[PDB]
């Protein structure tokens, strides 16, 4: 169940981007904090498009997952607002935004150790979800948010969080699903309504490819029908320029779901790169 926040307390500011049938804006929330102190807190405001209110339940059940669980690497949900005849989620605002944008923007300044650390944090987050038998279903660099930059003076590493998954792939139309190849695994392309836990292991491999490819989008040059043919012909992604994680990527992107390794095994593999 969602803590109610008032339109009177929420201020809408600039657009921050788009998701599937959603728009996000930076916001300000007036609230009473610890010790009764008044705070105007930066917040993320996610709005389901009016033309697609049909997806409100999945849109809201997506965020509910992230409230029933608490973990250092999972975005917080503050609640919802009846901010007009409109369905709106109020969430944690992450200073430095999406990882895919950050990778592009700072490809020259990011080394393999920075990439390895972020991969470990994502894997730890996914391990937590696996242990709870929860399927995220939308793991991608765009949904990974940078809380904190590396501090080269002190050697302090970056810190990331995984956002909520958004509208489930089990209800999205096929044209959107195909656009999301190769994040959407092949077994979900042939039947979206049979999502298994193994889904996130495949998408984790794809996201790992983004991390090693400095923000590039794998298979962006292929249209939807060619992305389908990519799966039909059982192709694998090419080794990213930084080929350190190529074998882990292809091991996670296994066309047999049951053969994809546990996230415990993935973490030990990431640790064993030392
Ligand atoms: N929680 C959450 N904080 C935030 N801060 C955020 C958003 C945009 C920016 C920045 C921060 C940083 C500033 C700018 N430059 C300049 C310097 C650094 C980078 C970039 C702009 N973004 N963000 C989120 C983001 C998403 C979903 N959810 N949340 C999301 C989750 C599930 C489904 C769909 C979506 C919608 C899209 C992705």
Numbering used by the authors: 536 to 809
Reported in the publication:
The JH2 domain has a key role in mediating both negative and positive regulation of JAK kinase activity and numerous disease mutations locate in JH2, including the prevalent hyperactivating JAK2 V617F in MPN. Previous studies have demonstrated that JAK2 JH2 binds ATP and possesses regulatory autophosphorylation activity on Ser523 and Tyr570. To gain insights on the compound binding modes to JAK2 JH2 and to analyze whether any differences could be observed between binding to WT and V617F, we determined the crystal structures of selected small molecules with JAK2 JH2 WT and V617F.
Diaminotriazole compounds 16–21, in addition to primary hit 1, demonstrated substantial binding to JAK2 JH2 domain ATP-pocket, i.e., competition of fluorescent tracer was at or above 30% at 100 µM compound concentration. It has been noted before that compound binding to JAK2 JH2 V617F can disrupt the aromatic packing of F617-F595-F594 and the conformation of F595 and F594 can be reverted back to the JAK2 JH2 WT conformation. In structures complexed with 6, 36, and 16, a WT-like conformation for the phenylalanines was observed. In the complexes with 36 and 16, the switch towards the WT-like conformation seems to start from the shifting of Gln626 gatekeeper position, which in turn affects the conformation of Leu624. This leucine forces both Phe594 and Phe595 to a new conformation. It appears to be possible to affect the conformation of the V617F region with small molecules, especially ones disturbing the position of the gatekeeper.
